[PDB]
Write a protein that binds this ligand. Structure first.
Ligand code: SAH
Ligand code: NA
Ligand code: NA
Length: 216
């Protein structure tokens, strides 16, 4: 068995989590501007939910689900600052949740995928399909196993991601992507044990995959 529950809750309680960049992940924002996000949106493993909030400002009704109660507090607090009525959040387990049958037209996984055990993937994919309206779109941003080793994080190879997701969705594209964060100084050692790319605006990125799919 393996579990990151205590770590995520401690990170959100707080120094802020490196992945809480205060904006949607750039790779996913690019899909939004292309018009790929439609209708009611589910932000699964939402964390502080920057992408939910950006979508709710654009007129979408959004729901964010996270196993961490501290994440859900932060998401609600930023929704209050922005005066949003159309963004809601709930504490739930993405691998086994109900109550939203056929509700969502777009489901977005912004780095949740690698944050659960490999054995939970089936239940997660079944749960989001159950919550999906006909023809829904699904987008995943996930670490690449070439960048993040076997350990607490269950990063994926392209073939592994395709095999897991294609059992439940029609895959349109899988391509290399960057996952952005603001890591502390000396993150992962000196020398560093991971390949961390330095980006503009003091951000960093790690290699990943961006998958686009739709319910068949
Ligand atoms: N089984 C599960 N169900 C729901 N959320 C989960 C989960 N396992 C992990 N999480 C959540 O997955 C998130 C991964 S970090 C990414 C958070 C956010 N989507 C962002 O892009 O900033 C964390 O908020 C963590 O608490
Ligand atoms: Na988890
Ligand atoms: Na690219």
């Amino acid at each position: 068995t393996e579990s990151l529950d205590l770590e995520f809750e401690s990170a959100y309680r707080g120094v802020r989590p490196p992945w809480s960049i205060g904006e949607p992940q750039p790779e996913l924002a690019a899909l939004i501007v292309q018009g790929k996000f439609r209708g009611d949106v589910l932000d699964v493993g939402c964390g502080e939910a920057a992408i939910s909030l950006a979508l709710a400002e654009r007129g979408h009704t959004t729901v964010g689900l996270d196993l961490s109660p501290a994440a859900v507090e932060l998401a609600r607090h930023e929704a209050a600052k922005r005066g949003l009525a159309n963004a809601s959040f709930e504490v739930a387990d993405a691998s086994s949740f109900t109550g939203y049958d056929g509700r969502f037209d777009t489901i977005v996984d912004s780095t949740l995928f690698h944050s659960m055990p490999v054995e939970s993937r089936e239940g997660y994919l079944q749960s989001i399909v159950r919550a999906a309206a006909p023809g829904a779109s699904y987008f995943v941003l996930v670490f690449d196993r070439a960048a993040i080793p076997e350990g607490p994080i269950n990063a994926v190879t392209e073939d592994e991601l395709r095999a897991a997701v294609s059992k439940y969705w029609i895959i349109d594209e899988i391509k290399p992507a960057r996952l952005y964060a603001r890591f502390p100084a000396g993150f992962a050692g000196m020398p560093a044990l991971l390949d961390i790319r330095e980006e503009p605006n003091g951000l960093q990125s790690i290699g990943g995959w961006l998958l686009s799919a739709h319910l068949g």
